[PDB]
PDB file of all heavy atoms in Angstrom:
ATOM      1  N   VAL A 157      -2.214   9.020   2.636  1.00 18.23           N
ATOM      2  CA  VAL A 157      -3.368   9.357   3.439  1.00 18.23           C
ATOM      3  C   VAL A 157      -4.238  10.207   2.568  1.00 18.23           C
ATOM      4  O   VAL A 157      -3.893  11.308   2.153  1.00 18.23           O
ATOM      5  CB  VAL A 157      -3.021   9.967   4.758  1.00 18.23           C
ATOM      6  CG1 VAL A 157      -4.278  10.626   5.379  1.00 18.23           C
ATOM      7  CG2 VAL A 157      -2.517   8.979   5.713  1.00 18.23           C
ATOM      8  N   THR A 158      -5.481   9.677   2.266  1.00 16.53           N
ATOM      9  CA  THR A 158      -6.405  10.418   1.404  1.00 16.53           C
ATOM     10  C   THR A 158      -7.768  10.545   2.050  1.00 16.53           C
ATOM     11  O   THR A 158      -8.158   9.814   2.898  1.00 16.53           O
ATOM     12  CB  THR A 158      -6.578   9.569   0.096  1.00 16.53           C
ATOM     13  OG1 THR A 158      -6.927   8.198   0.413  1.00 16.53           O
ATOM     14  CG2 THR A 158      -5.313   9.502  -0.734  1.00 16.53           C
ATOM     15  N   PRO A 159      -8.462  11.659   1.657  1.00 14.48           N
ATOM     16  CA  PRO A 159      -9.817  11.907   2.240  1.00 14.48           C
ATOM     17  C   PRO A 159     -10.772  10.734   1.882  1.00 14.48           C
ATOM     18  O   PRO A 159     -11.650  10.474   2.680  1.00 14.48           O
ATOM     19  CB  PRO A 159     -10.295  13.234   1.562  1.00 14.48           C
ATOM     20  CG  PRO A 159      -9.156  13.718   0.819  1.00 14.48           C
ATOM     21  CD  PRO A 159      -8.089  12.719   0.665  1.00 14.48           C
ATOM     22  N   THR A 160     -10.615  10.118   0.656  1.00 12.95           N
ATOM     23  CA  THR A 160     -11.555   9.018   0.306  1.00 12.95           C
ATOM     24  C   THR A 160     -11.401   7.857   1.270  1.00 12.95           C
ATOM     25  O   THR A 160     -10.300   7.506   1.693  1.00 12.95           O
ATOM     26  CB  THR A 160     -11.310   8.664  -1.116  1.00 12.95           C
ATOM     27  OG1 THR A 160      -9.961   8.058  -1.270  1.00 12.95           O
ATOM     28  CG2 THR A 160     -11.377   9.836  -1.965  1.00 12.95           C
ATOM     29  N   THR A 161     -12.528   7.214   1.606  1.00 14.69           N
ATOM     30  CA  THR A 161     -12.583   6.084   2.448  1.00 14.69           C
ATOM     31  C   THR A 161     -13.105   4.827   1.661  1.00 14.69           C
ATOM     32  O   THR A 161     -14.030   4.977   0.967  1.00 14.69           O
ATOM     33  CB  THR A 161     -13.448   6.379   3.688  1.00 14.69           C
ATOM     34  OG1 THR A 161     -14.821   6.303   3.271  1.00 14.69           O
ATOM     35  CG2 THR A 161     -13.223   7.644   4.291  1.00 14.69           C
ATOM     36  N   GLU A 162     -12.454   3.708   1.807  1.00 17.96           N
ATOM     37  CA  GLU A 162     -12.787   2.466   1.098  1.00 17.96           C
ATOM     38  C   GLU A 162     -12.727   1.320   2.104  1.00 17.96           C
ATOM     39  O   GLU A 162     -12.162   1.486   3.229  1.00 17.96           O
ATOM     40  CB  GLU A 162     -11.873   2.246  -0.037  1.00 17.96           C
ATOM     41  CG  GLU A 162     -11.786   3.354  -1.029  1.00 17.96           C
ATOM     42  CD  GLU A 162     -10.667   4.382  -0.736  1.00 17.96           C
ATOM     43  OE1 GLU A 162     -10.189   4.385   0.387  1.00 17.96           O
ATOM     44  OE2 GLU A 162     -10.276   5.085  -1.644  1.00 17.96           O
ATOM     45  N   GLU A 163     -13.274   0.254   1.728  1.00 17.28           N
ATOM     46  CA  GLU A 163     -13.153  -1.022   2.508  1.00 17.28           C
ATOM     47  C   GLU A 163     -11.732  -1.457   2.431  1.00 17.28           C
ATOM     48  O   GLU A 163     -11.105  -1.426   1.479  1.00 17.28           O
ATOM     49  CB  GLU A 163     -14.076  -2.055   1.981  1.00 17.28           C
ATOM     50  CG  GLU A 163     -15.523  -1.645   1.759  1.00 17.28           C
ATOM     51  CD  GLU A 163     -15.686  -1.036   0.362  1.00 17.28           C
ATOM     52  OE1 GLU A 163     -14.689  -0.792  -0.371  1.00 17.28           O
ATOM     53  OE2 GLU A 163     -16.885  -0.723  -0.040  1.00 17.28           O
ATOM     54  N   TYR A 164     -11.213  -1.905   3.674  1.00 18.48           N
ATOM     55  CA  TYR A 164      -9.819  -2.257   3.779  1.00 18.48           C
ATOM     56  C   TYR A 164      -9.604  -3.381   4.713  1.00 18.48           C
ATOM     57  O   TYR A 164     -10.493  -3.672   5.526  1.00 18.48           O
ATOM     58  CB  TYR A 164      -9.018  -1.022   4.285  1.00 18.48           C
ATOM     59  CG  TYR A 164      -9.402  -0.552   5.707  1.00 18.48           C
ATOM     60  CD1 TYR A 164      -8.560  -0.809   6.759  1.00 18.48           C
ATOM     61  CD2 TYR A 164     -10.562   0.137   5.940  1.00 18.48           C
ATOM     62  CE1 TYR A 164      -8.940  -0.405   8.001  1.00 18.48           C
ATOM     63  CE2 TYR A 164     -10.888   0.570   7.197  1.00 18.48           C
ATOM     64  CZ  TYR A 164     -10.108   0.287   8.235  1.00 18.48           C
ATOM     65  OH  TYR A 164     -10.404   0.652   9.502  1.00 18.48           O
ATOM     66  N   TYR A 165      -8.420  -3.983   4.647  1.00 14.36           N
ATOM     67  CA  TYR A 165      -7.980  -5.046   5.549  1.00 14.36           C
ATOM     68  C   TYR A 165      -6.793  -4.616   6.348  1.00 14.36           C
ATOM     69  O   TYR A 165      -5.993  -3.845   5.914  1.00 14.36           O
ATOM     70  CB  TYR A 165      -7.688  -6.316   4.779  1.00 14.36           C
ATOM     71  CG  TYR A 165      -8.918  -7.053   4.142  1.00 14.36           C
ATOM     72  CD1 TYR A 165      -8.770  -7.909   3.136  1.00 14.36           C
ATOM     73  CD2 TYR A 165     -10.177  -6.845   4.663  1.00 14.36           C
ATOM     74  CE1 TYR A 165      -9.824  -8.589   2.568  1.00 14.36           C
ATOM     75  CE2 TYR A 165     -11.246  -7.458   4.153  1.00 14.36           C
ATOM     76  CZ  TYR A 165     -11.108  -8.323   3.071  1.00 14.36           C
ATOM     77  OH  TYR A 165     -12.149  -9.008   2.608  1.00 14.36           O
ATOM     78  N   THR A 166      -6.678  -5.205   7.607  1.00 18.39           N
ATOM     79  CA  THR A 166      -5.516  -4.981   8.368  1.00 18.39           C
ATOM     80  C   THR A 166      -4.609  -6.229   8.333  1.00 18.39           C
ATOM     81  O   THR A 166      -4.936  -7.183   7.761  1.00 18.39           O
ATOM     82  CB  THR A 166      -5.909  -4.607   9.806  1.00 18.39           C
ATOM     83  OG1 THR A 166      -4.738  -4.281  10.625  1.00 18.39           O
ATOM     84  CG2 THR A 166      -6.662  -5.781  10.443  1.00 18.39           C
ATOM     85  N   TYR A 167      -3.432  -6.078   9.010  1.00 18.94           N
ATOM     86  CA  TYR A 167      -2.536  -7.234   8.978  1.00 18.94           C
ATOM     87  C   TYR A 167      -3.084  -8.401   9.795  1.00 18.94           C
ATOM     88  O   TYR A 167      -2.634  -9.509   9.663  1.00 18.94           O
ATOM     89  CB  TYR A 167      -1.184  -6.795   9.567  1.00 18.94           C
ATOM     90  CG  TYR A 167      -1.125  -6.842  11.070  1.00 18.94           C
ATOM     91  CD1 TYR A 167      -0.326  -7.776  11.761  1.00 18.94           C
ATOM     92  CD2 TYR A 167      -1.820  -5.917  11.849  1.00 18.94           C
ATOM     93  CE1 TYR A 167      -0.296  -7.767  13.129  1.00 18.94           C
ATOM     94  CE2 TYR A 167      -1.813  -5.955  13.226  1.00 18.94           C
ATOM     95  CZ  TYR A 167      -1.032  -6.889  13.850  1.00 18.94           C
ATOM     96  OH  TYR A 167      -0.974  -6.892  15.212  1.00 18.94           O
ATOM     97  N   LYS A 168      -4.082  -8.149  10.633  1.00 18.93           N
ATOM     98  CA  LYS A 168      -4.705  -9.272  11.408  1.00 18.93           C
ATOM     99  C   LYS A 168      -5.329 -10.258  10.499  1.00 18.93           C
ATOM    100  O   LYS A 168      -5.440 -11.491  10.875  1.00 18.93           O
ATOM    101  CB  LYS A 168      -5.770  -8.718  12.390  1.00 18.93           C
ATOM    102  CG  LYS A 168      -5.181  -7.775  13.447  1.00 18.93           C
ATOM    103  CD  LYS A 168      -4.471  -8.508  14.538  1.00 18.93           C
ATOM    104  CE  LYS A 168      -4.035  -7.610  15.643  1.00 18.93           C
ATOM    105  NZ  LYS A 168      -5.139  -7.037  16.398  1.00 18.93           N
ATOM    106  N   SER A 169      -5.740  -9.897   9.304  1.00 21.03           N
ATOM    107  CA  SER A 169      -6.478 -10.720   8.344  1.00 21.03           C
ATOM    108  C   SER A 169      -5.609 -11.348   7.276  1.00 21.03           C
ATOM    109  O   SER A 169      -5.956 -12.352   6.710  1.00 21.03           O
ATOM    110  CB  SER A 169      -7.657 -10.038   7.798  1.00 21.03           C
ATOM    111  OG  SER A 169      -8.410 -10.884   6.845  1.00 21.03           O
ATOM    112  N   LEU A 170      -4.583 -10.656   6.936  1.00 20.90           N
ATOM    113  CA  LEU A 170      -3.745 -10.993   5.740  1.00 20.90           C
ATOM    114  C   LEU A 170      -2.382 -11.630   6.190  1.00 20.90           C
ATOM    115  O   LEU A 170      -1.744 -12.198   5.307  1.00 20.90           O
ATOM    116  CB  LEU A 170      -3.490  -9.859   4.817  1.00 20.90           C
ATOM    117  CG  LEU A 170      -4.776  -9.083   4.399  1.00 20.90           C
ATOM    118  CD1 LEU A 170      -4.378  -8.047   3.340  1.00 20.90           C
ATOM    119  CD2 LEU A 170      -5.827 -10.064   3.804  1.00 20.90           C
ATOM    120  N   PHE A 171      -1.937 -11.380   7.409  1.00 19.72           N
ATOM    121  CA  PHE A 171      -0.559 -11.790   7.766  1.00 19.72           C
ATOM    122  C   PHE A 171      -0.470 -12.022   9.276  1.00 19.72           C
ATOM    123  O   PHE A 171      -1.476 -11.998   9.977  1.00 19.72           O
ATOM    124  CB  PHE A 171       0.407 -10.732   7.314  1.00 19.72           C
ATOM    125  CG  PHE A 171       0.855 -10.805   5.874  1.00 19.72           C
ATOM    126  CD1 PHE A 171       0.765  -9.783   5.069  1.00 19.72           C
ATOM    127  CD2 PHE A 171       1.462 -11.988   5.458  1.00 19.72           C
ATOM    128  CE1 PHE A 171       1.108  -9.871   3.735  1.00 19.72           C
ATOM    129  CE2 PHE A 171       1.824 -12.125   4.074  1.00 19.72           C
ATOM    130  CZ  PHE A 171       1.668 -11.078   3.272  1.00 19.72           C
ATOM    131  N   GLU A 172       0.773 -12.271   9.777  1.00 21.21           N
ATOM    132  CA  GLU A 172       1.067 -12.268  11.179  1.00 21.21           C
ATOM    133  C   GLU A 172       2.545 -12.230  11.293  1.00 21.21           C
ATOM    134  O   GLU A 172       3.300 -12.988  10.659  1.00 21.21           O
ATOM    135  CB  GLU A 172       0.472 -13.502  11.859  1.00 21.21           C
ATOM    136  CG  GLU A 172       1.002 -14.818  11.397  1.00 21.21           C
ATOM    137  CD  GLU A 172       0.296 -15.974  12.145  1.00 21.21           C
ATOM    138  OE1 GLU A 172      -0.533 -15.741  12.946  1.00 21.21           O
ATOM    139  OE2 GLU A 172       0.765 -17.155  11.811  1.00 21.21           O
ATOM    140  N   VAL A 173       3.086 -11.281  12.118  1.00 19.57           N
ATOM    141  CA  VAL A 173       4.509 -11.053  12.285  1.00 19.57           C
ATOM    142  C   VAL A 173       5.080 -12.091  13.180  1.00 19.57           C
ATOM    143  O   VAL A 173       4.641 -12.236  14.380  1.00 19.57           O
ATOM    144  CB  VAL A 173       4.820  -9.604  12.792  1.00 19.57           C
ATOM    145  CG1 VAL A 173       6.316  -9.502  13.074  1.00 19.57           C
ATOM    146  CG2 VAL A 173       4.365  -8.626  11.709  1.00 19.57           C
ATOM    147  N   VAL A 174       6.021 -12.906  12.735  1.00 20.94           N
ATOM    148  CA  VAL A 174       6.662 -13.990  13.556  1.00 20.94           C
ATOM    149  C   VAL A 174       7.765 -13.364  14.289  1.00 20.94           C
ATOM    150  O   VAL A 174       8.769 -12.851  13.616  1.00 20.94           O
ATOM    151  CB  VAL A 174       7.076 -15.087  12.613  1.00 20.94           C
ATOM    152  CG1 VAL A 174       8.202 -15.904  13.374  1.00 20.94           C
ATOM    153  CG2 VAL A 174       5.942 -16.021  12.212  1.00 20.94           C
ATOM    154  N   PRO A 175       7.852 -13.399  15.655  1.00 22.56           N
ATOM    155  CA  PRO A 175       8.979 -12.800  16.346  1.00 22.56           C
ATOM    156  C   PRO A 175      10.256 -13.582  16.052  1.00 22.56           C
ATOM    157  O   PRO A 175      10.252 -14.793  15.928  1.00 22.56           O
ATOM    158  CB  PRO A 175       8.542 -12.950  17.817  1.00 22.56           C
ATOM    159  CG  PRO A 175       7.575 -14.035  17.816  1.00 22.56           C
ATOM    160  CD  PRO A 175       6.873 -14.019  16.506  1.00 22.56           C
ATOM    161  N   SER A 176      11.377 -12.833  16.083  1.00 23.37           N
ATOM    162  CA  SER A 176      12.632 -13.496  15.848  1.00 23.37           C
ATOM    163  C   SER A 176      13.098 -14.289  17.100  1.00 23.37           C
ATOM    164  O   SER A 176      12.907 -13.883  18.230  1.00 23.37           O
ATOM    165  CB  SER A 176      13.695 -12.433  15.543  1.00 23.37           C
ATOM    166  OG  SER A 176      14.833 -13.008  14.866  1.00 23.37           O
ATOM    167  N   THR A 177      13.693 -15.489  16.855  1.00 24.34           N
ATOM    168  CA  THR A 177      14.262 -16.316  17.890  1.00 24.34           C
ATOM    169  C   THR A 177      15.663 -16.764  17.485  1.00 24.34           C
ATOM    170  O   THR A 177      15.933 -16.938  16.310  1.00 24.34           O
ATOM    171  CB  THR A 177      13.343 -17.489  18.191  1.00 24.34           C
ATOM    172  OG1 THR A 177      13.821 -18.248  19.248  1.00 24.34           O
ATOM    173  CG2 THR A 177      13.264 -18.437  16.941  1.00 24.34           C
ATOM    174  N   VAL A 178      16.491 -16.973  18.481  1.00 22.22           N
ATOM    175  CA  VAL A 178      17.890 -17.432  18.194  1.00 22.22           C
ATOM    176  C   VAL A 178      17.897 -18.919  18.232  1.00 22.22           C
ATOM    177  O   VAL A 178      17.633 -19.523  19.269  1.00 22.22           O
ATOM    178  CB  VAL A 178      18.863 -16.830  19.189  1.00 22.22           C
ATOM    179  CG1 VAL A 178      20.238 -17.555  19.114  1.00 22.22           C
ATOM    180  CG2 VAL A 178      19.045 -15.299  18.904  1.00 22.22           C
ATOM    181  N   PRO A 179      18.123 -19.567  17.123  1.00 22.94           N
ATOM    182  CA  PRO A 179      18.239 -21.079  17.069  1.00 22.94           C
ATOM    183  C   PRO A 179      19.624 -21.608  17.325  1.00 22.94           C
ATOM    184  O   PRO A 179      20.619 -21.019  16.908  1.00 22.94           O
ATOM    185  CB  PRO A 179      17.745 -21.418  15.696  1.00 22.94           C
ATOM    186  CG  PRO A 179      18.178 -20.223  14.801  1.00 22.94           C
ATOM    187  CD  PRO A 179      18.421 -19.050  15.736  1.00 22.94           C
ATOM    188  N   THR A 180      19.720 -22.731  17.986  1.00 21.41           N
ATOM    189  CA  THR A 180      20.932 -23.357  18.237  1.00 21.41           C
ATOM    190  C   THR A 180      21.556 -23.926  16.993  1.00 21.41           C
ATOM    191  O   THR A 180      20.886 -24.425  16.090  1.00 21.41           O
ATOM    192  CB  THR A 180      20.738 -24.581  19.220  1.00 21.41           C
ATOM    193  OG1 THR A 180      19.811 -25.502  18.663  1.00 21.41           O
ATOM    194  CG2 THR A 180      20.214 -24.040  20.580  1.00 21.41           C
ATOM    195  N   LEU A 181      22.869 -23.742  16.852  1.00 21.33           N
ATOM    196  CA  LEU A 181      23.618 -24.105  15.621  1.00 21.33           C
ATOM    197  C   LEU A 181      24.864 -24.854  15.996  1.00 21.33           C
ATOM    198  O   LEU A 181      25.572 -24.516  16.967  1.00 21.33           O
ATOM    199  CB  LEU A 181      24.016 -22.841  14.803  1.00 21.33           C
ATOM    200  CG  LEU A 181      24.863 -23.031  13.567  1.00 21.33           C
ATOM    201  CD1 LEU A 181      24.197 -24.050  12.659  1.00 21.33           C
ATOM    202  CD2 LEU A 181      25.098 -21.651  12.889  1.00 21.33           C
ATOM    203  N   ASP A 182      25.223 -25.849  15.236  1.00 24.34           N
ATOM    204  CA  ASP A 182      26.445 -26.635  15.328  1.00 24.34           C
ATOM    205  C   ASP A 182      27.546 -25.731  14.644  1.00 24.34           C
ATOM    206  O   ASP A 182      27.476 -25.225  13.602  1.00 24.34           O
ATOM    207  CB  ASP A 182      26.394 -27.930  14.655  1.00 24.34           C
ATOM    208  CG  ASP A 182      27.690 -28.582  14.538  1.00 24.34           C
ATOM    209  OD1 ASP A 182      28.560 -28.452  15.463  1.00 24.34           O
ATOM    210  OD2 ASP A 182      27.918 -29.393  13.525  1.00 24.34           O
ATOM    211  N   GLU A 183      28.699 -25.656  15.417  1.00 24.64           N
ATOM    212  CA  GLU A 183      29.771 -24.841  14.921  1.00 24.64           C
ATOM    213  C   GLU A 183      30.505 -25.494  13.765  1.00 24.64           C
ATOM    214  O   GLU A 183      30.965 -24.832  12.814  1.00 24.64           O
ATOM    215  CB  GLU A 183      30.837 -24.592  16.087  1.00 24.64           C
ATOM    216  CG  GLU A 183      31.429 -25.820  16.648  1.00 24.64           C
ATOM    217  CD  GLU A 183      30.616 -26.525  17.769  1.00 24.64           C
ATOM    218  OE1 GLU A 183      29.449 -26.179  17.886  1.00 24.64           O
ATOM    219  OE2 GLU A 183      31.122 -27.446  18.454  1.00 24.64           O
ATOM    220  N   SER A 184      30.582 -26.824  13.739  1.00 24.81           N
ATOM    221  CA  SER A 184      31.276 -27.546  12.697  1.00 24.81           C
ATOM    222  C   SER A 184      30.535 -27.500  11.372  1.00 24.81           C
ATOM    223  O   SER A 184      31.143 -27.236  10.315  1.00 24.81           O
ATOM    224  CB  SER A 184      31.589 -28.984  13.121  1.00 24.81           C
ATOM    225  OG  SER A 184      30.361 -29.730  13.275  1.00 24.81           O
ATOM    226  N   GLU A 185      29.245 -27.723  11.417  1.00 22.91           N
ATOM    227  CA  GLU A 185      28.445 -27.807  10.203  1.00 22.91           C
ATOM    228  C   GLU A 185      28.336 -26.439   9.599  1.00 22.91           C
ATOM    229  O   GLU A 185      27.909 -25.549  10.243  1.00 22.91           O
ATOM    230  CB  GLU A 185      27.039 -28.398  10.548  1.00 22.91           C
ATOM    231  CG  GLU A 185      26.417 -29.131   9.362  1.00 22.91           C
ATOM    232  CD  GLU A 185      25.855 -28.289   8.280  1.00 22.91           C
ATOM    233  OE1 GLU A 185      25.036 -27.350   8.648  1.00 22.91           O
ATOM    234  OE2 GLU A 185      26.157 -28.451   7.101  1.00 22.91           O
ATOM    235  N   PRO A 186      28.695 -26.290   8.263  1.00 22.45           N
ATOM    236  CA  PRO A 186      28.666 -24.962   7.610  1.00 22.45           C
ATOM    237  C   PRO A 186      27.232 -24.410   7.566  1.00 22.45           C
ATOM    238  O   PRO A 186      26.261 -25.175   7.421  1.00 22.45           O
ATOM    239  CB  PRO A 186      29.313 -25.224   6.287  1.00 22.45           C
ATOM    240  CG  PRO A 186      29.032 -26.640   5.999  1.00 22.45           C
ATOM    241  CD  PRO A 186      29.222 -27.236   7.339  1.00 22.45           C
ATOM    242  N   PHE A 187      27.144 -23.072   7.623  1.00 22.72           N
ATOM    243  CA  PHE A 187      25.799 -22.394   7.515  1.00 22.72           C
ATOM    244  C   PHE A 187      25.879 -21.388   6.376  1.00 22.72           C
ATOM    245  O   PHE A 187      26.912 -20.835   6.041  1.00 22.72           O
ATOM    246  CB  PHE A 187      25.474 -21.676   8.867  1.00 22.72           C
ATOM    247  CG  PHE A 187      26.571 -20.752   9.369  1.00 22.72           C
ATOM    248  CD1 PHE A 187      26.714 -19.482   8.906  1.00 22.72           C
ATOM    249  CD2 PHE A 187      27.531 -21.279  10.283  1.00 22.72           C
ATOM    250  CE1 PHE A 187      27.664 -18.716   9.358  1.00 22.72           C
ATOM    251  CE2 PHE A 187      28.400 -20.434  10.791  1.00 22.72           C
ATOM    252  CZ  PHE A 187      28.577 -19.122  10.334  1.00 22.72           C
ATOM    253  N   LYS A 188      24.694 -21.141   5.813  1.00 21.10           N
ATOM    254  CA  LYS A 188      24.518 -20.161   4.702  1.00 21.10           C
ATOM    255  C   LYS A 188      23.994 -18.877   5.292  1.00 21.10           C
ATOM    256  O   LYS A 188      22.938 -18.852   5.918  1.00 21.10           O
ATOM    257  CB  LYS A 188      23.634 -20.715   3.655  1.00 21.10           C
ATOM    258  CG  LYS A 188      24.052 -22.025   2.954  1.00 21.10           C
ATOM    259  CD  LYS A 188      22.966 -22.812   2.451  1.00 21.10           C
ATOM    260  CE  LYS A 188      22.225 -23.464   3.666  1.00 21.10           C
ATOM    261  NZ  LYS A 188      21.002 -24.180   3.219  1.00 21.10           N
ATOM    262  N   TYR A 189      24.674 -17.788   5.115  1.00 23.10           N
ATOM    263  CA  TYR A 189      24.358 -16.484   5.734  1.00 23.10           C
ATOM    264  C   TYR A 189      24.379 -15.390   4.617  1.00 23.10           C
ATOM    265  O   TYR A 189      25.223 -15.419   3.684  1.00 23.10           O
ATOM    266  CB  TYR A 189      25.338 -16.180   6.804  1.00 23.10           C
ATOM    267  CG  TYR A 189      24.804 -15.192   7.804  1.00 23.10           C
ATOM    268  CD1 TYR A 189      23.510 -15.194   8.265  1.00 23.10           C
ATOM    269  CD2 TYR A 189      25.703 -14.176   8.301  1.00 23.10           C
ATOM    270  CE1 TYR A 189      23.037 -14.260   9.146  1.00 23.10           C
ATOM    271  CE2 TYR A 189      25.209 -13.263   9.199  1.00 23.10           C
ATOM    272  CZ  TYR A 189      23.924 -13.286   9.668  1.00 23.10           C
ATOM    273  OH  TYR A 189      23.456 -12.371  10.547  1.00 23.10           O
ATOM    274  N   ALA A 190      23.505 -14.436   4.799  1.00 23.20           N
ATOM    275  CA  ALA A 190      23.415 -13.309   3.886  1.00 23.20           C
ATOM    276  C   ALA A 190      23.089 -11.974   4.654  1.00 23.20           C
ATOM    277  O   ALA A 190      22.487 -12.067   5.719  1.00 23.20           O
ATOM    278  CB  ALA A 190      22.283 -13.490   2.816  1.00 23.20           C
ATOM    279  N   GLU A 191      23.657 -10.879   4.223  1.00 22.41           N
ATOM    280  CA  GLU A 191      23.497  -9.589   4.839  1.00 22.41           C
ATOM    281  C   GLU A 191      22.953  -8.594   3.797  1.00 22.41           C
ATOM    282  O   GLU A 191      23.788  -7.870   3.186  1.00 22.41           O
ATOM    283  CB  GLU A 191      24.715  -9.084   5.494  1.00 22.41           C
ATOM    284  CG  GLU A 191      25.283  -9.969   6.567  1.00 22.41           C
ATOM    285  CD  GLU A 191      26.211 -10.984   6.051  1.00 22.41           C
ATOM    286  OE1 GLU A 191      26.486 -11.063   4.834  1.00 22.41           O
ATOM    287  OE2 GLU A 191      26.761 -11.830   6.894  1.00 22.41           O
ATOM    288  N   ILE A 192      21.649  -8.539   3.578  1.00 23.25           N
ATOM    289  CA  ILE A 192      21.022  -7.501   2.776  1.00 23.25           C
ATOM    290  C   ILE A 192      21.562  -7.508   1.351  1.00 23.25           C
ATOM    291  O   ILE A 192      20.866  -7.739   0.396  1.00 23.25           O
ATOM    292  CB  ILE A 192      21.143  -6.141   3.386  1.00 23.25           C
ATOM    293  CG1 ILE A 192      20.526  -6.137   4.808  1.00 23.25           C
ATOM    294  CG2 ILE A 192      20.556  -5.083   2.532  1.00 23.25           C
ATOM    295  CD1 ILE A 192      19.062  -6.382   4.886  1.00 23.25           C
ATOM    296  N   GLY A 193      22.870  -7.139   1.252  1.00 18.26           N
ATOM    297  CA  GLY A 193      23.470  -6.970  -0.126  1.00 18.26           C
ATOM    298  C   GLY A 193      23.545  -8.270  -0.885  1.00 18.26           C
ATOM    299  O   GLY A 193      23.415  -8.216  -2.184  1.00 18.26           O
ATOM    300  N   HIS A 194      23.668  -9.401  -0.224  1.00 21.70           N
ATOM    301  CA  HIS A 194      23.684 -10.675  -0.968  1.00 21.70           C
ATOM    302  C   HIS A 194      22.310 -10.923  -1.647  1.00 21.70           C
ATOM    303  O   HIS A 194      22.252 -11.473  -2.716  1.00 21.70           O
ATOM    304  CB  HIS A 194      23.991 -11.797  -0.019  1.00 21.70           C
ATOM    305  CG  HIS A 194      25.389 -11.689   0.558  1.00 21.70           C
ATOM    306  ND1 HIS A 194      25.764 -12.214   1.817  1.00 21.70           N
ATOM    307  CD2 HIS A 194      26.553 -11.164   0.048  1.00 21.70           C
ATOM    308  CE1 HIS A 194      27.009 -11.960   2.001  1.00 21.70           C
ATOM    309  NE2 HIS A 194      27.499 -11.344   1.028  1.00 21.70           N
ATOM    310  N   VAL A 195      21.189 -10.574  -0.921  1.00 21.37           N
ATOM    311  CA  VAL A 195      19.887 -10.655  -1.585  1.00 21.37           C
ATOM    312  C   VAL A 195      19.725  -9.672  -2.683  1.00 21.37           C
ATOM    313  O   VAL A 195      20.036  -8.431  -2.523  1.00 21.37           O
ATOM    314  CB  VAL A 195      18.818 -10.494  -0.489  1.00 21.37           C
ATOM    315  CG1 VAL A 195      17.431 -10.427  -1.162  1.00 21.37           C
ATOM    316  CG2 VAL A 195      18.829 -11.611   0.560  1.00 21.37           C
ATOM    317  N   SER A 196      19.313 -10.131  -3.855  1.00 24.44           N
ATOM    318  CA  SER A 196      19.147  -9.290  -4.964  1.00 24.44           C
ATOM    319  C   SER A 196      17.787  -8.636  -5.062  1.00 24.44           C
ATOM    320  O   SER A 196      16.847  -9.086  -4.337  1.00 24.44           O
ATOM    321  CB  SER A 196      19.331 -10.074  -6.299  1.00 24.44           C
ATOM    322  OG  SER A 196      18.138 -10.771  -6.683  1.00 24.44           O
ATOM    323  N   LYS A 197      17.628  -7.563  -5.775  1.00 24.37           N
ATOM    324  CA  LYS A 197      16.421  -6.857  -5.895  1.00 24.37           C
ATOM    325  C   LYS A 197      15.271  -7.744  -6.507  1.00 24.37           C
ATOM    326  O   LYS A 197      14.110  -7.505  -6.214  1.00 24.37           O
ATOM    327  CB  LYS A 197      16.528  -5.566  -6.678  1.00 24.37           C
ATOM    328  CG  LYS A 197      16.958  -5.832  -8.130  1.00 24.37           C
ATOM    329  CD  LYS A 197      17.425  -4.488  -8.812  1.00 24.37           C
ATOM    330  CE  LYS A 197      17.037  -4.541 -10.324  1.00 24.37           C
ATOM    331  NZ  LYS A 197      15.634  -4.462 -10.568  1.00 24.37           N
ATOM    332  N   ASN A 198      15.632  -8.691  -7.323  1.00 23.57           N
ATOM    333  CA  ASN A 198      14.639  -9.580  -7.945  1.00 23.57           C
ATOM    334  C   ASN A 198      14.175 -10.656  -7.134  1.00 23.57           C
ATOM    335  O   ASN A 198      13.237 -11.432  -7.558  1.00 23.57           O
ATOM    336  CB  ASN A 198      15.266 -10.091  -9.286  1.00 23.57           C
ATOM    337  CG  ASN A 198      15.036  -9.131 -10.474  1.00 23.57           C
ATOM    338  OD1 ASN A 198      13.906  -8.688 -10.646  1.00 23.57           O
ATOM    339  ND2 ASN A 198      16.000  -8.897 -11.288  1.00 23.57           N
ATOM    340  N   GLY A 199      14.781 -10.908  -5.942  1.00 22.22           N
ATOM    341  CA  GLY A 199      14.258 -11.853  -5.003  1.00 22.22           C
ATOM    342  C   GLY A 199      15.007 -13.188  -4.918  1.00 22.22           C
ATOM    343  O   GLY A 199      14.433 -14.175  -4.515  1.00 22.22           O
TER     344      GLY A 199
END
């Protein structure tokens, strides 16, 4: 937070947050899952 003021954009113009939904999944068909640690810092 700085005293200087500049032209800026909000998330309304550059993005939109997609709410999470629970999708139906087949138990037999294997699924690929990751928990934070599996994702690497490089993407």
Side-chain angles (χ1 to χ4, degrees):
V157 164
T158 53
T160 64
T161 75
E162 305 89 341
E163 311 85 352
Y164 65 105
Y165 289 158
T166 184
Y167 84 111
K168 297 286 184 67
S169 179
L170 309 184
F171 276 125
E172 60 181 4
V173 173
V174 159
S176 199
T177 186
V178 166
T180 59
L181 175 56
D182 171 32
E183 62 274 14
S184 64
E185 209 284 307
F187 53 82
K188 298 152 288 172
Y189 201 41
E191 299 90 1
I192 301 299
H194 297 150
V195 173
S196 84
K197 63 191 210 72
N198 270 314

